[PDB]
Structure 1
Amino acid sequence: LPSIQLPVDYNNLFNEITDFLVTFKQKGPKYMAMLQKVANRELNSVIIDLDDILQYQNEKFLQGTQADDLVSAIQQNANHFTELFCRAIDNNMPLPTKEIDYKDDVLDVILNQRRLRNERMLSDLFPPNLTRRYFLYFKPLSQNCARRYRKKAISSKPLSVRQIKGDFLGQLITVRGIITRVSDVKPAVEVIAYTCDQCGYEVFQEVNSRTFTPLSECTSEECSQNQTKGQLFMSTRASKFSAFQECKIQELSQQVPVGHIPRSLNIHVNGTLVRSLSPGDIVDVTGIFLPAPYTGFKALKAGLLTETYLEAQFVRQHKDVYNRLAKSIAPEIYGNLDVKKALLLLLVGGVDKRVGDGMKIRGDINVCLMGDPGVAKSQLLKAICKISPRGVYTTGKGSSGVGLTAAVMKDPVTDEMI
């Protein structure tokens, strides 16, 4: 393992981050208040705005006490600064002010008993991630902030699945596309908790990969001094879980080069951002582009090719009354005033649908427009049919193969009538 001398210092960057969370002021410090809210169990998501980091950096430089460029460091390698920010928050966390319940806290009784036992044994602990109950997310650097302070924004600059190459791996980038598949929320384990039937001691194991190997024999100092072969058994009541969703994002029709087919990019959503993406939606998702190293024998036979994915961090969504509201059904069309009145009545769908002891009366005003070619029917039809929030323009034949009402077809692959 030959070593290189990279021009990055992590102690100085950690000190800068610690100072940032205790000095920034967009009321007391913004992030101190945000953390105070979390300690009261009122907030479960802290979002770090890189615009704030840029503002703090420029304020420090203006005073003459220039420091390292934290913003560029975060984007160039983002998977490492999540840990740094979490550690800083843990170190500078404030004590709660509002009385908490503390009644049904499994990982408070467990920890209290673990402290009591450890103190009694020593007189004669747990991984940091286990106690964390907040999620840290990064907000990209907005273009306005970058242009204000004479800098270029790489994270916010939208890209396409075509432009996401291997050079961008490990950075905070934005992707523009249409969601084409979403999965059900499932619990992805982060810290497994075991219990020894002999010691009464709990063993915590961190899992940070697609696969893990469960523990069998207790590793507690009690099972070591006595050399008892106690067996560890998994307990899902004390473990830590995070909501997990897997989605797919595809390129828009405006980004595919001629003669090429659209590509798809997998997206992983963890924490509270889950359920913010739905099928058939245009979004601007910012996340960390990371690989997924293989494990086991698959690693040897797979080769050097790496399967990658996106870790979502931020999501942005691309969003006489009678006579007057009648002559406005299709201002462009000229005549047919009474017809337009009738179409307005259709739009209102005027009814107070009545259901008594079972009888149902339809509440739909059907209308037909016969005549001869040339009179403005189709133009009227598409205008009236666009006006409504929901509409479907189709020919008398029907929507493609299936005709108007419905039809049962043999499944091409499963050969089941659907």
Structure 2
Amino acid sequence: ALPSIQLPVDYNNLFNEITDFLVTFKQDTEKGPKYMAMLQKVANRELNSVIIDLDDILQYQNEKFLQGTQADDLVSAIQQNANHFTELFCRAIDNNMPLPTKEIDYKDDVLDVILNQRRLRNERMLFPPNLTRRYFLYFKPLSQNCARRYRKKAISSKPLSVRQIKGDFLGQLITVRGIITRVSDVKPAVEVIAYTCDQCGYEVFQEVNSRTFTPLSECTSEECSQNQTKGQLFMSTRASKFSAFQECKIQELSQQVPVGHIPRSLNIHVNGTLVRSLSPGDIVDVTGIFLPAPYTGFKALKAGLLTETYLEAQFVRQHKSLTSDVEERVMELITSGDVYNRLAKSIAPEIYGNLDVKKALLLLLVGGVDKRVGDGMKIRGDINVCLMGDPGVAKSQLLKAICKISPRGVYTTGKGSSGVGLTAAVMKDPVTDEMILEGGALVLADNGICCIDEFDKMDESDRTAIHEVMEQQTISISKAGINTTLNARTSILAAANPLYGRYNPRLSPLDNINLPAALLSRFDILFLMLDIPSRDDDEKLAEHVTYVHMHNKQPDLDFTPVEPSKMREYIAYAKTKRPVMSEAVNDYVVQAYIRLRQDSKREMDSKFSFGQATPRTLLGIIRLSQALAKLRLADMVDIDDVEEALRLVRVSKESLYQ
């Protein structure tokens, strides 16, 4: 039949030592046992989880070694095998559960009502213990610090990868380092199922220890022993115990993959209060038990002796507001002074020059006023900045760098992927094969910045969305029978490449690029950065570039790089602020606009300028004054603010020659 083998481990002495450790253990550094305190805390319907530390277990072993009596190296037994010690510890907790000391508080708990109703009828006229349980038991991996303190080495907490997980580590407690890619919704998994039986005896309980089960549907009680055909069992959800279950996939980091290989993936299962600890896009260190999946059902026959695997998770270690602190940070930055120039300069300190562009990127980072006028009129406060110019002028570092500053931002590129206009209504998700409404990148960045690199090569299909956002900021959705309009208020940062190379003495700016005049008119600001050879500038550029290669540090200079978290804190605080205008300030704007138009009537010339001024220019003047006012000022806007905005616009306009 089944042969027998002798193994050193005996579970009786282990159980005795667990019972001794629960009572005796004290924190050496409230007084008394460490865990009977938290058990009493649990009994008062406040704590939902019990977490054991193997450092503490080593402390009990060290205490016993100080006494000198032999031990059973419980820490090694837990590491080698952990699926059984969970049940052992659960039984040990159940045996020594303290009484409720205060605030019994039975209000509307359905399971409580069922259990209380059971008592009267059972006594007047044995169930699975897990039904009465509420706490969840988790283990905590070892610490190298405590290990090195008492040697003994450590295996459970070592940050292995997905690839270093061999088949020799199955059934042990290990830790894996990786990035979370997919997380699923929370669903209930049955643990104890209760069937109601046509007022025959009473409801019956069955435990489920697999992913698949069979209903009972036959009443075996003493009163139900009567021979007449009477009916099968019906399930009752209220008297049954469920649990929260979640499954995730972790993927190997790019640094740890060897050359020529493709990264692998691992599956993680989490049950209990630990659910929702992991989200997509997080680099974490997850500890758990590595167990074999049954792989049954279809396609099991072909494998024969091949199994799946998964990791039952028990611990999570993620690697990486209005308060007086941030109230004082802004005051400190105000007392620092030179906020405008320093804020513009610290943006991408590697790149030397293009300081006006850095001023304009700051105004794009902040947003103008979005005022909802009555009778349906709306006015946009978002910023549309396009940066044109010859190749090899740092076109595509500037952009990427701006994406770092604001959390709400997406870097979308040419026809390699379609994300600008992918407001599709069909999503063939493999998990369920049903449609999901999937928004595009333009919709994704709300109150944010959309960085569209290589805008020249992008197709007219995305041009439709770009045209519509600047008009109404509300994306109409695909024609898959939903008729949905989605909010898409966003600011646009575009990078352009002139047609066939560099700037051309062809006079029309429309000839330099493919973009239509109407599309360019909606842009708030246009910047031309042409590469003109000058003997002085090349020397400083070469020196600046080569200093970075010689020493990895950027070239030290009197200019001080402000700390980036301060950048974010000031930018957010400015964004929260709401300006206001006065009647006197806007009167000078009319004079400015009429002077600009009287210039534009004669400004039509062979080479310089793009068409003529439009009322959209007046709108953008106020829109840009918004950000310059939000930068440091409040309440009414200064008159010199309009001068600053006009100066920035005029420099951008004069960039056509330069």
Q: Give the TM-score of the pair, scaled to structure 2.
A: 0.57
Contact 1:217–1:229 (Cα < 8 Å) also in 2: no
Q: CA RMSD in A?
A: 3.5
- For 1:167 and 1:136, locate their aligned partners in 2 and report how far apart those are by CA, in whole Å: 25
Contact 2:370–2:379 (Cα < 8 Å) also in 1: no
Partner of 1:44: 48
Deviation per CA, 1:276-319: give whole Å up to 9, x if none.
22223222111111123366898777622222211111122122
Alpha carbons of structure 1 residues 294 and 153: separation in structure 2 relative to 1, 3 Å:
same
- For 1:371 and 1:107, locate their aligned partners in 2 and report how far apart those are by CA, in whole Å: 71
In structure 2, stretches of 5+ residues that fail to align are 321-337, 436-658
Shift of 1:231: 3.5
Contact 2:412–2:420 (Cα < 8 Å) also in 1: no
Contact 1:188–1:243 (Cα < 8 Å) also in 2: yes
Aligned residues: 414
Shift of 1:362: 1.4
Deviation per CA, 1:50-73: give whole Å up to 9, x if none.
121112211221232331111111
RCO comparison, higher one (Cα < 8 Å, 6+): 1
Shift of 1:258: 2.2
Q: Which moved more, 1:16-25 or 1:36-45?
A: 16-25
Alpha carbons of structure 1 residues 355 and 41: separation in structure 2 relative to 1, 3 Å:
farther
- For 1:213 and 1:376, locate their aligned partners in 2 and report how far apart those are by CA, in whole Å: 66
Alpha carbons of structure 1 residues 37 and 347: separation in structure 2 relative to 1, 3 Å:
same
The DSSP-based 3-state class of the residue aligned with 2:60 is helix
Alpha carbons of structure 1 residues 250 and 73: separation in structure 2 relative to 1, 3 Å:
same
Deviation per CA, 1:223-249: give whole Å up to 9, x if none.
348898663221111000001112212
Alpha carbons of structure 1 residues 303 and 393: separation in structure 2 relative to 1, 3 Å:
closer
- For 1:233 and 1:408, locate their aligned partners in 2 and report how far apart those are by CA, in whole Å: 40
- For 1:413 and 1:46, locate their aligned partners in 2 and report how far apart those are by CA, in whole Å: 33
Contact 2:55–2:142 (Cα < 8 Å) also in 1: yes
The DSSP-based 3-state class of the residue aligned with 1:325 is helix
Alpha carbons of structure 1 residues 44 and 226: separation in structure 2 relative to 1, 3 Å:
farther
In structure 1, stretches of 5+ residues that fail to align are none
Contact 2:111–2:238 (Cα < 8 Å) also in 1: no
Shift of 1:75: 1.1
- For 1:331 and 1:58, locate their aligned partners in 2 and report how far apart those are by CA, in whole Å: 55
- For 2:58 and 2:430, locate their aligned partners in 1 and report how far apart those are by CA, in whole Å: 56
- For 2:298 and 2:135, locate their aligned partners in 1 and report how far apart those are by CA, in whole Å: 35
Deviation per CA, 1:235-279: give whole Å up to 9, x if none.
111000001112212211122222222222121111112222222
Deviation per CA, 1:187-229: give whole Å up to 9, x if none.
1100000122143412110000111111122222333488986
Contact 1:179–1:282 (Cα < 8 Å) also in 2: yes
Contact 2:197–2:234 (Cα < 8 Å) also in 1: yes
- For 1:45 and 1:414, locate their aligned partners in 2 and report how far apart those are by CA, in whole Å: 33
Q: Which moved more, 1:58-67 or 1:156-165?
A: 58-67
Contact 2:245–2:271 (Cα < 8 Å) also in 1: yes
Alpha carbons of structure 1 residues 234 and 169: separation in structure 2 relative to 1, 3 Å:
same
- For 2:190 and 2:180, locate their aligned partners in 1 and report how far apart those are by CA, in whole Å: 26
Structure 1 or 2, whichever has the larger Rg, is: 2
Deviation per CA, 1:15-63: give whole Å up to 9, x if none.
2112222222333322112111211111111111112111221122123
- For 2:373 and 2:157, locate their aligned partners in 1 and report how far apart those are by CA, in whole Å: 54
Partner of 2:489: none
The DSSP-based 3-state class of the residue aligned with 1:144 is helix
User: What aligned pairs does 1:159-198 form with structure 2 within 5 A after superposition?
Assistant: 159-198=160-199
Partner of 1:137: 138
Contact 1:179–1:249 (Cα < 8 Å) also in 2: yes
Deviation per CA, 1:308-343: give whole Å up to 9, x if none.
211111122122322222221233334344432222
- For 2:306 and 2:112, locate their aligned partners in 1 and report how far apart those are by CA, in whole Å: 44
- For 2:298 and 2:243, locate their aligned partners in 1 and report how far apart those are by CA, in whole Å: 28
| Residue number among 327, 331, 345 corresponding to 2:349 in the alignment | 331
2:54 is aligned with 1:66: no
Alpha carbons of structure 1 residues 216 and 60: separation in structure 2 relative to 1, 3 Å:
same
Deviation per CA, 1:336-370: give whole Å up to 9, x if none.
44432222222223445546554322122223344
Contact 1:182–1:248 (Cα < 8 Å) also in 2: yes
Alpha carbons of structure 1 residues 408 and 302: separation in structure 2 relative to 1, 3 Å:
closer
